[PDB]
Amino acid sequence: AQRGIREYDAKNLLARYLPEYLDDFSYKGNLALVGPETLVVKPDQLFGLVLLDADWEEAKEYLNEKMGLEVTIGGITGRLSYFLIEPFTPHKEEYYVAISSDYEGDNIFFSMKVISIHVDSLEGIDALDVGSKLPAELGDKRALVEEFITALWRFYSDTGFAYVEINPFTFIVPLDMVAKLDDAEEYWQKKRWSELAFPEPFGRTPSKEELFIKEIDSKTGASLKLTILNPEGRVWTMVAGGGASVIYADTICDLGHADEMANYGEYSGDPNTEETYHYTCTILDLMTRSKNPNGKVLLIGGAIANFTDVAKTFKGVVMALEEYQQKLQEADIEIYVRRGGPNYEQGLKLMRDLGKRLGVPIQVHGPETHMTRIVPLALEE
Amino acid sequence: KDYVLFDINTKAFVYGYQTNAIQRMLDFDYVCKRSSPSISAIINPSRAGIHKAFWGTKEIILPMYKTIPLAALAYPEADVMVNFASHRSAFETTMEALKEDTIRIVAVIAEGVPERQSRVMAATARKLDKIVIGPATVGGMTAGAFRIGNTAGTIENIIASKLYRPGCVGFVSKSGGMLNEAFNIISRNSDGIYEGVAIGGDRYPGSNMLDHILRYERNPAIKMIACLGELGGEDEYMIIQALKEKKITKPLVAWVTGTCSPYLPASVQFGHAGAKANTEKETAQAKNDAFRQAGAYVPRSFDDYGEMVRQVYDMLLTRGIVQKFDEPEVPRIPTDYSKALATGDIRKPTTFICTISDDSGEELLYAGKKLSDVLDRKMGIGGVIGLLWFKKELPEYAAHFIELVIQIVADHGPAVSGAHNAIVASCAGKDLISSLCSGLLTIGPRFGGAIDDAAREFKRAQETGLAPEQFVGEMKKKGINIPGIGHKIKSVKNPDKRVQLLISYARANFPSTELLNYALQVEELTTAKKGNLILNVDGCIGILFIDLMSSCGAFSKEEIDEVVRLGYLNGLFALGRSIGLIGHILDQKRLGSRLYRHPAEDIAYMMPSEEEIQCK
Amino acid sequence: DSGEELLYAGKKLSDVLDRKMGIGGVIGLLWFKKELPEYAAHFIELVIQIVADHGPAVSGAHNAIVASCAGKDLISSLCSGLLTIGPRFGGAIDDAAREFKRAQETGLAPEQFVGEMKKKGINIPGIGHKIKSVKNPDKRVQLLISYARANFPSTELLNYALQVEELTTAKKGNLILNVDGCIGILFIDLMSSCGAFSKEEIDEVVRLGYLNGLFALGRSIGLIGHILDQKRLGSRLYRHPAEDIAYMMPSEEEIQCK
Amino acid sequence: DSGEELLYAGKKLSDVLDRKMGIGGVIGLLWFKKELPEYAAHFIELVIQIVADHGPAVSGAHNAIVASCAGKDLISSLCSGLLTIGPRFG
Amino acid sequence: GCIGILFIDLMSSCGAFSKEEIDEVVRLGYLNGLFALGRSIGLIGHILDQKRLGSRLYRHPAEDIAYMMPSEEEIQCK
C-alpha cells in the first residue's frame, strides 16, 4: 500500500539523500517536529493554519494556543497534535514539481499551465533530454531545475516513493512537501527509512490491537489485516481474502448497517493455526469489551479458497472461541459461518461441534449457500 | 495462436518447492484426461534432484533443477513458469525467466512486491511480447487444459464447478479468492468458464484486465466475457474505453466491488495493495456507472452477478451463438490418505508403542514429565536416566549415585579393549562416531559385563538364602570365579579408590545396603585366601545398583530381575565409558597419530599343513 | 591408569569426586584437558539432559528400536542407532558453530551473512523449526539461551545469532534459532568465556567434531531408553510396510552394457 | 520382493542363477544396475579373493580380533573391524 | 592403486557409463564397499579363529604407551 509521510520526514529524506545526485547545498536539514508529548510553524497531520515569519517567542504562542485544538477537516473532527517548525525563506518565484507513476513509467509534473515529462520504466531519465520544459521565464534558472527534477526522479526511484509533491519551491529550496512511500519497499529501504514511522490519519488515535495484527502480518507471506471502524459497533467480521471482505462490507452497507460495522478485516494467503488464533483472539477481545442491548454479531465468511487450509485456519478460530466462551455468552454474541476451500468439511465439522458445546448460536454454511447470504440472515433476522 | 495463453499441450516449470501446488496441477491434468503432465521440471534454488508425485494413483518422477537457465536448456518445450518465490525474490526470478528465449508466461504468486518492480516486470513483458500474471495472484486456468499452481483449489471443487471441461465464458478478476467463487457462480449460471484469470490486487499489475479481455475477444471458443473489478486505480477504464471504441463486441458482464467505501472513512486502505480510491473516478460507484453507460451487463450488487451471467448465457442460446454441450464422464481421484486420517474417515493401527518420551505435543515429555519441569527441578543427568530408563522419579541419593558411577567409569586408560579399538579406528582416520562404535562394540561379557554378572550372582545367592561361605564354596566347585571379585594390584592393605568412593557413598547415603552387607561378608572370605580378592569396581556397581533399587521401594523382586536380565547395567557402563572413548579418539586426532599396524613379532603364525586342510 | 590411582588429565580421580566436578567437569578434563569453571561444567550437563531424547521417530532412535525389535542386545542396538549421527541427524550443531563463528569473525554484518547464505542456496544451519516460532518458542532453546544469558561471562556469538534470528524471523516466523544452533553457538561462547582457548584451538574443537560427541553422549541415554522400552514391551520384528515403497526397476535395455 | 519372485534390478533371481551370473554378476545388478560382461563380473570376484585377507595385524582384522577376544558375537566383532575402513585402511 | 585404476578401465570397457557416471561411482564410494565386502571374509575368519583358539581378553601392554599428562597450570581456564 501507499502510505503518506509527515512533511518533516519527506524534507529530512530530501535534505539527506538529494545532495547525492545533485550539489544540493541550497537546502539544509533545519527541521523541528512538535507532537502532543514533546520561522514558519504549520500542522504536520497529512493536510492540504500556517504561521509565516515569526519569532520563537511568537512560535511558542501559536503552539500552546493550537495544541489540542478541536478542528473539523474533511468532515473528521480531531485535535491538533503534530506541527512542523522550519526557517522562513523570503521568496519571489514559486514553482511546482510532482512525481507519480502510471502503468508505463513515472510522470514528472512542472509549473511556474503544467508540463508533463514521462520517464519510461526500462529506459530511465538518462534516455531523456529536457527541451519539454517551459522556456517562458526559465532562462537563467532552466539548467538548474532540469538538473534538480532529474535528481528528484533518482531520489523518487531509489527511495521507494509512490508520490512526491513540492508545491511550492523557489531559489533551489523546498517550501511545502507531500509524500507517499510504497510500504512494500520496506525490505529494500532499511537505511533510508531508518529515522521515520508512518503516521496515523488525522482524527484517528493508534490502536494496540491493530499494531499487534500488523506485527503478525510482517513475519509471514500470508495476509492478516485489521482496521477498527467503530469500537462500539454491533457487526464484527472475520472474512478470508481481500476480494470477499470488501464484498461482505458492500452487502452490510447495502442493507443500511454501515454505522453498526465495527471493523474492516482480512486474512488470506494460507495463514497457520497460530496466526489465525492470535487474530481471532484480537477480534474477540475488542467485541467483548462493551455489552450491547441487542447483542453482537460475528460473521466468519469468505469465498471458496484456492489454497488457504480451512481445517488449520478454523482450528485457530475454534481455539480462540473456546477461550472466549464466558465473554461470548455474556455479550449475547451470535456466530455466522460460510466457508469453502481446502479441507472445508473438516473445518465446518469443528465449528458445528463447537456450537453444540459453547452455548452460543453458531450457524454453519458451506459452498451450497451463496457467499454473502449469511449477511441478511444475521442483520434482517 | 496469440490469444491462447494455455492449452492441453502447455508445459511448465514450477519455481519453488511447493509440493501441494505441484500435486494440485498434476491432479487437474489427470481429471482433464491430459496425455502428459503440465510440469516439465521444478526449480528448487536449494537443491537439484527428483520429486515424486501422483498421476492419479500412479507415482511419477519430476526432475528438479537449481536454476531457471539449467531447467530451460533441459526442457525448451516449457513456455510457462509458475513462480512461488517470496516478495523478496519474485523480481529477480521473474526477470531471469523473462530473459529466457523459451519462456513466454510468468505467473507471480507473491504478495507484497514493490510497485516499481511490478512496473519494470510489466514493461519488460510488453517489450518482449511476453505475459506476466500477477503479482499477488493464484494465477488462472483454461478449463480442461491447464491450471496455474493452486488455482481453483481442491479436486472436489474442480469436479463440483465442472472445470475439467471448457465452457463459453472468458473470465477476468483482480481477486484470487473471488476467481474461485466466480468459477462456482459461472458453472451454476452457464456452461462454465472456458478460461479464467486473476490479475492480482496490486496497483501496477504485470498485465491489466483488458489484456486478457482482448484475448477472449479474439478466441472463437469464447462467446461470453465476465469480469469482477474493485475500487482504486483506472484499470477498468481501459475496458470501458475499449467497450466504447467497439473493441469488445462479445457481451460483457461487469461488476466493481468497493461500494462500502463512501459510507466509511476516506483513509481506509482495503485488503489488496491497489484497493483504495484516491479520486472519485477511482470509486466502485463511478466505475459501475461508467460500465453501465458503455453497454456492459452490470448487476444491482454482487448478489445478482450469477443472475446477470444466466441472462447473458440464455441470450446466446436463443440466438444460437452457444451450442448445447453433453456432459462428459465425471472424473474420479481417490482421497489423500492424510485427509482420510485427519477427518477420522479411517482408523490406522500404530506399529510401535513408546512409553518413555513424547515429542508430539507443545513440549517434549520424558516419562510423561515436561522437560522444563525436569530442568527447573534440577533432576540432573541421573534423574533424566531415572525417567528415560526406569520410568521413575528417583530420590536424590539414587540420581547422584547414577552420576557418580558415570564419572567413575568414564575412563580407565587407553589400554583396555574399548579404548584400544576406538584409538585404532581414530588412527585409521575415522570420524568420531565410527571410532566410538568401533570401541563400544567390545562391551560385553569380558569388558564391562562383570557388572551385570556381579549383580546376577550376588542377588541369587543372597535371595536363595545361601550363607556367604556356601556361595564361595558353590562357585569354587563349579570352577567359576566370582564376578566382581579380584584385582591385579589392589588388595586389602592397598584398596582401589573407585570402589572405596562407591562403597563409602552407599554406606553413608543409601537407606538400605543389604546386598552390599552380604558382598562384604563374601569379600572377607575371598580376601582370607588371597589379599587381592577384593570387591572390584564392576562388582561394586552391580551390587550397589540392586541395593539402590531395593532402597527406592517401587521395584518388585521380578522388576529387579528384569533390570539385571535386560542389561540396563551394560548401558550405564556404555554411557559412562563413551566419555573416555570420545576423549581417546579426540586425543589421537590432536596428536596427528598415524595408522596402527599390530607388530609382526606379537603374532604366532601357525598355518595348517596340506594334509590338515584336506576333505576326506 | 598406570599408577597408584587413576588420573583424568593429570588430576587424581578421588580429587575429581571430592571436588564435585561432576559429569561436566569430567568431560572438561577428558575432552578439553581443562578444569572448567562451574557455569561451563553445568552447561555441558544441561546440554546432555536437553538432547537426551527427542522421541522414537528420529533416525537414531528409530534404528535402535528396529535393532531392539530384531532381538539384538543393548550394545549392538545402540551402535545401530549411533551410526546415523552425522551431517543430517545431530550435525547441524557443528555446522551452526562453524558458520556463525566464521561470519562473526570475518566481521560480516548479520544482514550480509543472511544475504550470502541465500545467494549460495544454503539454509542457515541452526535456523528453522517445523512448528515452533517467535510467538510459540521451543522450550529446549529457551532453557539454553536463558541459562547462557544469566550465567555466561560473555555471549558475543549468541548476541550475533540473535541479530541473525531477527532477520530470518522477519521472513517466516518459524525461522527461529533451533536447539542444534543454540548448542553450537553457545559452546563457542563458553570456550571464549573460559579464556584458555585461542581462536585456532576453538576452530580445532569445531573441526574435530567434539560437538558431535556431546550430541552422541547425550542422545545415547534416549537410545538405550528406547531399546529397553521395546524389550519391556516384548515388541516383534519390524518389517517396513510394502505400500511405503515405490519399486522402480530398470528395464532390460537400461541394464545393458554397450 | 513384492511379486511372485524376487527381482535383482528387474531380473528374476531364478534367471540370475540359471545363467550362472555369479557373485560378480549379482553385484553388477545390485550395485551398478548392469548385466555386466563375463570379464567384468570375474574381475569383481577376483578383487574379492585378492582383498579377502591381509593377515591379522592390519587395523580391521586387529579390531575384529580384539572384540572377539572380549567375547563378543561374530556380528559385533565384524562391525568393530569394518568401522576402521576409511581413508587410511582401504 | 591397481583396483581403483582397473575399476575405471572396467567401467570404460562396459561402454554404458558416461564420464559423469564414472565420477559418481568414485565419489559415492562403491570401491570402499567392494573392499568391505571382500575384507569381511578375512574379518569373519579371524573372529572365528580366536573363538576356536579360546583366546583371552586383550589388554594393550602398558610399556607401549607414553603417558604425557598435562600439568596443573596447563589445565587452568584464564
Ligand SMILES: CC(C)(COP(=O)(O)OP(=O)(O)OC[C@H]1O[C@@H](n2cnc3c(N)ncnc32)[C@H](O)[C@@H]1OP(=O)(O)O)[C@@H](O)C(=O)NCCC(=O)NCCS
Ligand atoms: C509466496 C510464498 C509461496 C512464499 O513461500 P514462503 O513460505 O513464505 O517462504 P519461502 O519458501 O520462499 O522461504 C522464505 C525465506 O526464508 C528463507 N529461509 C528458509 N529457511 C532458511 C534458513 N534455515 N535460514 C535462512 N533462511 C532461510 C528462504 O531462503 C526464503 O528467503 P527469501 O524470501 O529471501 O527468498 C508464500 O508466502 C505464499 O503462499 N504467499 C501467499 C501469496 C498470496 O496471497 N498471493 C495472492 C493469492 S490470490
Ligand SMILES: CC(C)(COP(=O)(O)OP(=O)(O)OC[C@H]1O[C@@H](n2cnc3c(N)ncnc32)[C@H](O)[C@@H]1OP(=O)(O)O)[C@@H](O)C(=O)NCCC(=O)NCCS
Ligand atoms: C600354592 C600356591 C601355588 C597357590 O597359588 P595362590 O596364588 O595362593 O592361589 P590360587 O591360584 O590357588 O587361588 C587362591 C584361591 O582363590 C580362589 N579365587 C581366585 N579368584 C577368585 C575369584 N574371583 N572369586 C573367588 N575365588 C577366587 C581360587 O579358586 C583359590 O581357591 P582355593 O584356595 O580354595 O582352591 C601358592 O600359594 C604358593 O606358591 N605358595 C608357596 C608354597 C610354598 O612356600 N611351598 C614351599 C616351597 S619350598
Ligand code: NA
Ligand atoms: Na504479510
